[PDB]
């Protein structure tokens, strides 16, 4: 019943931008918490953006890495989740997931299968 | 930034033996609401990450009773009593208490040979 659905990856020379999309569905969308993380292809798991649901105002709060560069935001009436991503590098290569919280307590208790990012010109 | 440390990176397992996996975080991850949001994760080869443990403890829905969480103050604990193949994978242990969010660098169970 519950689907996360990314979409947005691409290939990109750096300083270019991208934005990723995150379609959902069997859920009450405006009430959970959503995320975006990334995992490069060595590496772990990093988060990245996060935002609240409405009865926490919506609110957000973002990784000093992607601070100022990345914003996330969420479109309620359509059940989606997206993040604008400018100035991009190396660093920024990698799988990207969106993923939505549970309400006993938990981030991340549901992700998409995630859209690939490649940088490097 | 509060940081995660996990050990071992890699946990040569045999079928059907109990392995530990263990994380340090560097500081108290208490939330101010009063609970520790302390989640494991476990990303199979080709597939997303999958929620195993919320607050420290918390089996998550739908995963096999083989897996438990424990732990106090920064030291944290993710038990499995019998690997089967299908827990084959990389771990990661996450803090969800204070920003910026944090993972561990991720243990990988894999087949001793
Ligand atoms: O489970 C219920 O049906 C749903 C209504 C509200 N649940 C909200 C959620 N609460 C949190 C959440 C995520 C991380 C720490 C504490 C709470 O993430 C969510 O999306």
């Known amino acids: 019943e519950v689907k996360l659905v990314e979409s947005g990856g691409g290939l990109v020379q750096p300083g270019g931008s991208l934005r990723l999309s995150c379609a959902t569905s069997?859920?009450?969308?405006?009430?959970?918490?959503m995320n975006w993380v990334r995992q490069p292809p060595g590496k772990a798991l990093e988060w990245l953006v996060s935002?609240?649901?409405?009865?926490?105002?919506?609110?957000?709060d973002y990784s000093a890495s992607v601070k100022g560069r990345f914003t996330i935001s969420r479109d309620n009436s359509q059940s989606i989740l997206y993040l604008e991503m400018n100035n991009l590098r190396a660093e920024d290569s990698a799988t990207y997931y969106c993923?939505?919280?549970?309400?006993?307590?938990?981030?991340?208790?549901?992700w998409g299968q995630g859209t690939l990012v490649t940088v490097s010109a | 930034q509060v940081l995660m440390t996990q050990t071992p990176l890699s946990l040569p397992v045999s079928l059907g033996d109990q392995a530990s996996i263990s994380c340090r975080s560097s500081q108290s991850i208490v939330h101010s609401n009063g609970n520790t949001y302390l989640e494991w994760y476990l990303q199979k080869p080709g597939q997303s990450p999958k929620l195993l443990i919320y607050k420290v403890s918390n089996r998550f829905s739908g995963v096999p009773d083989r897996f438990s969480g424990s732990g106090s103050g920064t030291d944290f604990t993710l038990k499995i009593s019998r690997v089967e193949a299908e827990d084959l994978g990389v771990y990661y242990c996450f803090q969800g208490s204070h920003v910026p969010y944090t993972f561990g660098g991720g243990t990988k169970l894999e087949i001793k040979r």
């Open positions: 935002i609240r649901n409405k009865a926490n105002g919506y609110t957000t």
């Open positions: 993923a939505r919280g549970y309400g006993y307590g938990a981030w991340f208790a549901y």
């Open positions: 069997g859920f009450t969308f405006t009430n959970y918490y």
